[PDB]
């Protein structure tokens, strides 16, 4: 709720990895350039690794990110927040290294 109230002016959208529309929500948030809060990070979705790795290609004035096949313009100020609700979990080193 702190994150929601802090980023309400930027219209932060609340979602989770369990949601089936997570990829569509990710694409929409990344296209418009607004913050995303993804809870339930227990079942981390490997499609988000290019976002976490910040693999960005400044090519031809088209900043783009490799999400699957269709690469989408990486709008500035796209902050994604990952969150969970339990305190006992052993995150894989792939995810642990890419986040604070």
């Amino acid at each position: 709720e702190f994150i929601m109230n802090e980023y309400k002016d930027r219209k932060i959208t609340r979602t989770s990895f369990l949601d089936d529309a997570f990829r569509k929500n990710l694409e929409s948030a990344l296209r418009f350039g607004n913050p995303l809060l993804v809870q339930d990070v227990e079942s981390y979705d490997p499609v988000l690794n290019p976002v976490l790795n910040r693999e960005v290609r400044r090519t031809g004035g088209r900043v783009l990110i490799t999400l699957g096949d269709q690469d989408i313009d990486l709008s500035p100020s796209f902050v994604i927040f990952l969150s969970t609700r339990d305190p006992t979990v052993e995150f894989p080193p792939d995810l642990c290294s890419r986040v604070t």
Binding site: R23, L64, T66, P93, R98
Partner: protein
């Protein structure tokens, strides 16, 4: 949008034919999933800001897509509704009278729907029908009308069900068939079983217009007093109600007449048995027991009323004496032969008279005179008053203070329970609960008599009792309507075990039961005792009226919802002694009390002294079955003694004979002496004698003689097996559905085959069996399928066999049919066979057609351990246990020798040579001196797999057969001077020893082979090999008959320089040639085998080159992944084999005539076991190997394999993902432990390669031997230490030496004039990059460096004092044109500059070049230079593995390709990506770097795909049909662009594989499978220092 627009111009509706000769749509998956994918794609592309390519086309295409979605979403529902309602309105008759308004409405709707279907048929294009105006509106209107008419049908069906309340017990389709098939009353006759209590059929007139009466399953028949005629009552509900009323009335009148008639018998004494028997026959068993109960209750009541004043001449003693004389008459009557129905009535009368006797004798003789005393009031009392006009009020049953009536519902004849004190208190408690309007909830251990006691109480009161079994038999969709029926008919409900239901089902059913119980108890309100408005509860959103007769019973083993509404009784310990005493007394047994007192503790001991197996059942049901069998045996002996009263037969002998005849077959070998010791304890000095069955034994002996098997009688060889066959015969006689269970390696199949032959020869009835493997075939294909749209029935395999047997074509009853189920039993498929195994003998297909198997058919199962079988399936059928001790070893030897002496190997000279060989080897097999001792020694040794006697012996037998074939060939080559007898003896003895060596403990390490050889040396007198310092396993038996070493037959080969370490080049060596000869030995006998060994030990190449070595073998390489299913083998047959029906049966043979197909199975143990511990593909291959064929699913026909044979290879079962193979399959396939090649073998096979590559430069040709010695010794040293225990990736195999040789050859390939120090330095560099970078500790690395220097010094001392050239030992190709060694500094500067430009042009985060990064870059560059260089980057995440890999790939120009992975990433997507990279690597010449992360591996199947792609170089199971044709075209084009002539697919595919070998490097980045550890160069990319 290009791919999206082009694919929508080619879709077809995929029309199919319907049973009404109409058109339907198939392929909803292809027509919805791809549409949703296109919707997602267009939404994503219009979402992404890169939409300045197409703007209006996307929106137009999206609205089209939504149009397709809406149209087909409505269309599928409309089609389903129309097909269902068309079936309902056409198959069912009398619909014209059954609501014709809906008939006409459906006619109009079907007319419109068929017009639309014609419109679609004329235009089968998807967008053509969309463009037709009015399609969507008409389709939606059709959907609405179909919904309305389906609602009307449901409401009519509910109205009809409410009209006759017993219709609530049957489903919707059954009720539809009942109300439709009014003319065909025979269709209702099968549904009469569910609706009513005991009646199974109603008796009609000759013209089927008047219901004369009813009947039952057993044969009991009741004539209606006033028959009802369907003529003036045409409606089904009306005349069924009349039948129910007339049935009540008829039972009432017949009971009144029976009571009046039994007053005559009960007046005093001196009852005449003839008139008593006539009375028993006249009236039904229900009414007979009712009459006895009423007479006894009234007589005792009058006796007590007379006794009320005091000791008034004791008429109660007269009542007891009358009961005694009646019971004596009954006991005399059961001894004489009676009809089965009269027998059942007589046993019911005996048990009830015993209860009546005991009551008065014990509880009432203790000075009770008052008729109102509780000691008399506690007993269940019957008061009959025929004066009352109402049928349901005449008889009243009163227990304690409760006053029930008798629902006059016909129960047929149901087995009664003896009124034990536990049963008496059960009756008391349940009646007290029912009087207080509370359901009864008995609890206790299962099998104690709760459900049976509740059902017996319900039948005593005449109520119809429903029993709902708990395990997998609940249909919650029907539970509500069943409750409504119970409420509206006044029936009973008894849940078999309420706590077995899971939480949701238990909660829902408990809520329904709570509502029912509150409704029921509202009938007894203190202020609302008089019910004006009938009590209605809420079920199915309607107010269902509650009848006071209704009751609900549950049995625990209790929910909080029902604690306050249900009374509980504990029935933990039933009275087995009294039950046995009464049943034995009712069976005519004298002194039955002693027999019960002995038998009950005996069954208690058997649950305690004996072992614990699932198939054992010593409960009360088994005891009762033993008792009835003992009664049958006693009557049979009485009849036999008569034909040559007689109350002198020993009863204990009969009892133990019944016990043994029933229970011995189920016993294991260890339990038989325990059972007989227990019998000697409980039944001392009493003997059990087996049935002689001499008539069957002679035929058994003849069949065994003609089948080469061993027959015995009792104690000699074969006695246990023939006894098991006789037990199988007795179980076949007693019941149907029996299963044969025992460890694999017993004579199960031989037993039933021999018994079938004996039955055919003795009885003259022809017996043909139908062996079905149910695990290999799909269950949906085993029983059948209904297509969702057409709903057409395609029968399954078992269903087709049963229908062929039932249909009147051939041998319906003149032939005995045995459906043998070979394999493993589990709930999945035995769910359907449960209805066939029980007394129902019915198979209910989901089409609705019921199939009842004829009496001749027996449903046989042969399994191995019976551990995934439901208790329901085991209890429903008898069984015999085939212990492993049954099939003795000497009888297997006798069978082998007889078969060898009789059957020609080349189906007279062969017969003579075989007979001579058998005469020679007789003193070894049959005598327990050599082969038995060696067998037990091999069993007490350890092998790579579990040792099964039959496998270890079958390999031996096949090897001896090959020895005979070798002698025959020796005779063929030399016509003059053939094999003499002395040479024959010597050769056969030595080859027998050699075959024991290779079969026994032939799948173990060299040490255990040496131990077996030493043991044989101790226990034989045959001439052993001369040298005592060389193991016997190395020697070979030459055709001359003398031990010749295998090394002398090892040749020398000179492989060409450009073929060094090639994909498929095998250089002969000791192990290679020895395994090749053994492999040929098992190849000749068409015997499948599996080569098992550590990874990269030379299993695939040895077998694979051996398979092309023979000229008549055509090899097929199949890879068994975890997801491997039998459809893989079906596809292989479909592509490489053809089906022909010209022989007596269908035969499967390869297309290439005169060629023996071999299907090599890579990783045969890899396929995963299902959740019941069986591998589908392994069971399928076992079916093919053993029975020589399988069943086609298309037409359910057995097809025999011709010129088809299987061979496999696998890692040991201890490795990850290696499930052990089944013993049944294992006994068919011998296995060879392909261990790592020895120092000498490696030395030879790699000195060959050293000489081959060093021939390129003549100056270095002298250096091959020291180079090979150095490589081999350093590899051995690096193998002894750094084992798998320290680090899981410290695996050493001879594939690393292959990489060593290939890397050195690649380095020397463009180079010339290399001095000796150059060879040593490149050798040391490859040693570092193959044996040191894999290490984890600096101490290990320095040890590797020191020993590399040590071995380089030792094997050649003429090298300069420089170690290799300097300390770093660096190599680079950028600084020069060739792979010239480089120094540190300028290499570092070049790498710094190129990394700087790398991250200024491609990356955005600067990189530093520290020493570790430079070394790892050099390693990855060396790997990319080498074709099929695959790297294993092991290290912490985020340490630069991927970044360095991409950096060096850009530096070398390799295109980088990696998998864009997501959560829903699937197998076919990964296979498509593999296809893409393989196309870009083989075709369209392009070096590709395949960077795959550990997280990129989501399924083990991806890992198996990588394993088959890395070592082999291609994926055989990757290219199917259209894609195969496209890549063949592309390879042809690319080859002609490279100017190469391939033409043949075989050769063009070979070129593609070579190009992929050259143009594909896979880099695997892993954070800290042994198979994956090999075939990749390991690089310990440690954490930053």
């Amino acid at each position: 949008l290009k791919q999206i627009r082009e694919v929508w111009n080619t879709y077809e509706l995929d029309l199919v034919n319907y049973q009404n000769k109409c058109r339907l749509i198939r392929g909803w998956d292809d027509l919805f999933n791809k549409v949703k994918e296109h919707i997602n794609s267009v939404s994503a592309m219009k979402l992404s800001p890169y939409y300045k390519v197409f703007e209006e086309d996307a929106l137009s295409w999206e609205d089209k897509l939504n149009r397709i979605m809406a149209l087909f979403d409505v269309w599928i529902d409309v089609q389903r509704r129309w097909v269902y309602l068309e079936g309902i309105f056409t198959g069912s008759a009398d619909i014209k009278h059954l609501l014709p308004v809906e008939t006409q409405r459906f006619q109009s709707i079907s007319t419109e729907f068929l017009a639309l279907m014609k419109k679609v048929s004329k235009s089968p294009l998807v967008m053509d029908v969309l463009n037709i105006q009015g399609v969507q509106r008409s389709l939606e209107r059709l959907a609405d009308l179909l919904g309305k008419i389906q609602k009307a049908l449901g409401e009519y069906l509910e109205r009809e069900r409410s009209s006759f309340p017993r219709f609530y017990f049957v489903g919707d389709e059954d009720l539809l068939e009942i109300i439709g098939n009014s003319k065909n009353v025979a269709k209702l006759q099968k549904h009469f079983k569910k609706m009513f209590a005991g009646v199974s059929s109603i008796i009609l007139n000759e013209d089927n217009s008047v219901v004369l009466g009813i009947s039952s399953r057993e044969g009991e028949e009741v004539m209606f007093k006033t028959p009802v005629s369907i003529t003036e009552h045409p409606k089904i509900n009306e005349w069924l109600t009349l039948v129910e009323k007339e049935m009540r009335v008829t039972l009432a009148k017949l009971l009144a007449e029976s009571v009046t008639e039994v007053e005559i018998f009960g007046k005093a004494t001196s009852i005449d048995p003839n008139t008593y028997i006539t009375w028993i026959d006249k009236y039904q068993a229900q009414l007979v027991v009712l009459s006895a109960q009423i007479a006894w209750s009234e007589n005792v009541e009058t006796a007590l009323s007379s006794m009320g004043g005091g000791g008034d001449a004791a008429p109660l003693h007269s009542v007891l004496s009358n009961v005694e004389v009646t019971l004596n008459v009954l006991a005399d009557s059961v001894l004489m032969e009676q009809p089965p129905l009269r027998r059942r009535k007589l046993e019911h009368l005996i048990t009830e008279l015993v209860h009546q006797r005991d009551v008065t004798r014990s509880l009432i003789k203790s000075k009770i005179d008052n008729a109102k005393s509780f000691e008399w009031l506690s007993q269940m009392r019957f008061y009959f008053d025929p004066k009352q006009t109402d049928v349901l009020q005449q008889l009243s049953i009163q227990m304690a203070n409760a006053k029930f009536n008798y629902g006059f519902e016909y129960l047929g004849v149901q087995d009664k329970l003896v009124q034990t004190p536990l049963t008496d208190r059960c009756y008391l408690t349940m009646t007290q609960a029912l009087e207080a309007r509370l359901g009864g909830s008995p609890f206790g251990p299962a099998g104690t008599g709760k459900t049976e006691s509740v059902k017996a109480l319900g039948h005593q009161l005449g109520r119809f009792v429903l029993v709902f079994n708990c395990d997998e038999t609940f249909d919650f969709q029907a539970m509500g309507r069943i409750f409504v029926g119970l409420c509206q008919v006044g029936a009973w409900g008894c849940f078999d075990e309420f706590n077995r239901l899971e939480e949701r089902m238990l909660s829902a059913v408990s809520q329904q039961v709570q509502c029912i119980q509150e409704a029921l108890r509202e009938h007894s309100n203190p202020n609302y005792d008089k019910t004006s408005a009938p009590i209605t509860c809420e079920l199915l959103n309607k107010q269902v009226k509650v009848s006071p007769d209704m009751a609900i019973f549950i049995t625990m083993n209790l929910p909080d919802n029902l604690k306050k509404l249900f009374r509980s009784l504990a029935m933990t310990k039933p009275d087995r002694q009294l039950i046995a005493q009464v049943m034995l007394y009712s069976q005519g047994f004298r002194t039955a009390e002693v027999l019960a007192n002995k038998i009950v503790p005996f069954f208690k001991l058997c649950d305690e002294q004996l072992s614990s197996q699932s198939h054992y059942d010593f409960g009360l049901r088994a005891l009762k079955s033993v008792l009835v069998s003992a009664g049958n045996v006693k009557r049979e002996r009485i009849q036999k003694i008569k034909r040559e009263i007689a109350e002198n037969l020993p009863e204990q002998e009969i009892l133990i004979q019944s016990v043994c005849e029933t229970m011995v077959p189920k016993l294991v070998a260890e339990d038989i002496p325990l059972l007989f010791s227990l019998l000697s304890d409980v039944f001392p000095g009493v003997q059990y004698h087996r049935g002689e069955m001499t008539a069957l034994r002679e035929e058994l002996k003849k069949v065994c003689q003609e089948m080469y098997l061993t027959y015995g009688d009792g104690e000699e060889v074969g006695g246990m097996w023939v006894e098991k066959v006789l037990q199988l015969y007795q179980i076949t006689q007693i019941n149907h559905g029996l299963m044969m269970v025992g460890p694999s390696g017993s004579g199960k199949s031989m037993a039933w085959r021999v018994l079938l032959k004996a039955l055919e020869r003795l009885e003259g009835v022809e017996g043909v069996a139908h062996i079905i493997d149910p695990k290999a075939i799909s269950k949906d294909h085993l029983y059948g399928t209904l297509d969702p749209n057409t709903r057409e029935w395609t029968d399954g395999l078992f269903t087709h066999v049963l229908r062929k047997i039932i249909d009147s074509v051939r041998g319906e009853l003149q032939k005995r049919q045995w459906i043998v189920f070979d394999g493993d039993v589990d709930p999945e498929w035995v769910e359907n066979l449960n209805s066939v195994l029980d007394d129902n003998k019915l198979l209910t297909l989901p089409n609705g057609e019921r199939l009842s198997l004829p009496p001749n058919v027996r449903i046989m199962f042969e399994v191995q351990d019976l551990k995934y079988a439901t208790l329901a399936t085991v209890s429903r059928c008898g069984m015999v246990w085939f212990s492993e001790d049954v099939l003795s070893t000497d009888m297997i030897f006798n069978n082998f020798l007889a078969r060898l002496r009789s059957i020609p190997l080349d189906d007279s000279p062969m017969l003579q040579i075989q007979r001579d060989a058998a005469t020679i080897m007789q003193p070894y097999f049959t005598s327990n001196g050599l082969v038995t001792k060696a067998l037990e020694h091999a069993f007490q040794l350890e092998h790579i797999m579990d040792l099964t006697r039959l496998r270890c012996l079958g390999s031996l037998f096949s090897m001896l057969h090959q020895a005979c074939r070798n002698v025959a060939q020796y005779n063929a080559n030399h016509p003059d001077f053939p094999m003499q007898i002395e040479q024959l003896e010597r050769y056969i003895q030595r080859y027998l020893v050699y075959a024991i060596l290779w079969s026994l403990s032939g799948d173990s390490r060299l040490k255990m082979r040496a131990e077996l050889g030493e043991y044989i040396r101790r226990i034989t007198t045959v001439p052993l090999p001369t040298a005592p310092n060389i193991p016997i396993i190395d020697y070979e038996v030459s055709i001359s008959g003398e031990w010749s070493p295998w090394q002398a037959k090892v040749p020398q080969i000179e492989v060409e320089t450009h073929k060094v370490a090639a994909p498929d080049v095998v250089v002969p060596t000791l192990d290679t040639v020895r395994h090749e000869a053994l492999l040929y030995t098992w190849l000749a006998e068409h015997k499948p085998l599996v080569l098992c060994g550590p990874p990269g030990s030379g299993k695939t190449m040895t077998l694979f080159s051996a398979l092309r070595a023979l000229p008549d073998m055509e090899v097929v390489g199949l890879n068994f992944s975890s997801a491997t299913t039998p459809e893989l083998l079906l596809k292989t047959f479909d592509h490489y084999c053809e089906y022909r029906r010209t022989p007596n049966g269908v035969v499967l043979a390869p297309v290439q005539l005169g060629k023996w197909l071999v299907l090599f199975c890579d990783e045969i143990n890899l396929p995963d076991m299902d959740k019941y511990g069986t591998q589908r593909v392994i069971s399928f291959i076992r079916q093919m190997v053993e029975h020589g064929g399988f069943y086609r699913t298309s037409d359910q026909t057995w097809v025999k394999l011709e010129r088809i044979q299987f061979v496999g290879a696998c890692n040991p079962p201890t490795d990850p993902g290696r499930k052990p193979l089944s013993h049944r399959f294992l006994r068919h396939v011998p296995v060879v432990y392909v261990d790592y090649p020895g120092p000498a073998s490696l030395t030879q096979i790699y000195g060959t390669f050293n000489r081959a590559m060093l021939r390129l430069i003549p100056s270095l040709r002298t250096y091959a031997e020291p180079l090979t010695a150095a490589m081999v010794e350093f590899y051995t040293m690096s193998q002894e230490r750094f084992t798998q225990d320290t680090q899981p990736h410290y695996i050493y195999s001879p594939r690393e030496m292959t990489r060593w040789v290939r890397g050195i050859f690649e380095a020397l390939r463009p180079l010339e004039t290399l001095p000796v120090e150059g060879l040593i330095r490149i050798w040391a560099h490859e040693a570092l990059r193959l044996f040191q970078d894999r290490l984890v500790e600096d101490e290990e690395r320095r040890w590797t460096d020191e020993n590399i220097d040590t071995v380089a010094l030792k094997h050649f001392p003429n090298i300069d004092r420089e170690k290799a050239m300097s300390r770093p030992i660096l190599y680079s190709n950028w600084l020069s044109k060739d792979y010239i060694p480089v120094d540190q500094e300028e290499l570092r500067d070049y790498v710094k500059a190129r990394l700087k430009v790398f991250y200024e042009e491609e990356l955005d985060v600067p990189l530093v070049l520290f020493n570790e990064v430079l070394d790892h870059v050099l390693r990855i560059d060396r790997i990319f230079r080498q074709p099929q260089g695959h790297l294993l980057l092991i290290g912490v995440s985020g340490a630069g593995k991927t970044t360095l890999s991409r950096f060096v790939a850009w530096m070398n120009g390799l295109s980088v390709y990696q998998i864009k992975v997501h959560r829903k990433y699937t197998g076919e997507d990964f296979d498509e990506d593999l296809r893409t990279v393989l196309r870009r690597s083989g075709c369209k010449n392009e070096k590709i770097a395949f960077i795959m992360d550990e997280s990129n591996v989501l399924d083990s199947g991806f890992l198996e795909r990588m394993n088959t792609l890395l070592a082999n170089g291609e994926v055989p199971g990757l290219f199917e049909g259209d894609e195969y044709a496209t890549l063949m075209t592309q390879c042809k084009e690319g080859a002609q662009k490279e100017g190469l002539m391939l033409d043949s697919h075989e050769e063009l595919y070979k070129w593609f594989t070579s190009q992929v070998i050259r143009n594909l490097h896979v880099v695997f980045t892993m954070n800290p499978s042994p198979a994956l550890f090999n075939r990749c160069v390991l690089n310990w990319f440690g954490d930053w220092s």
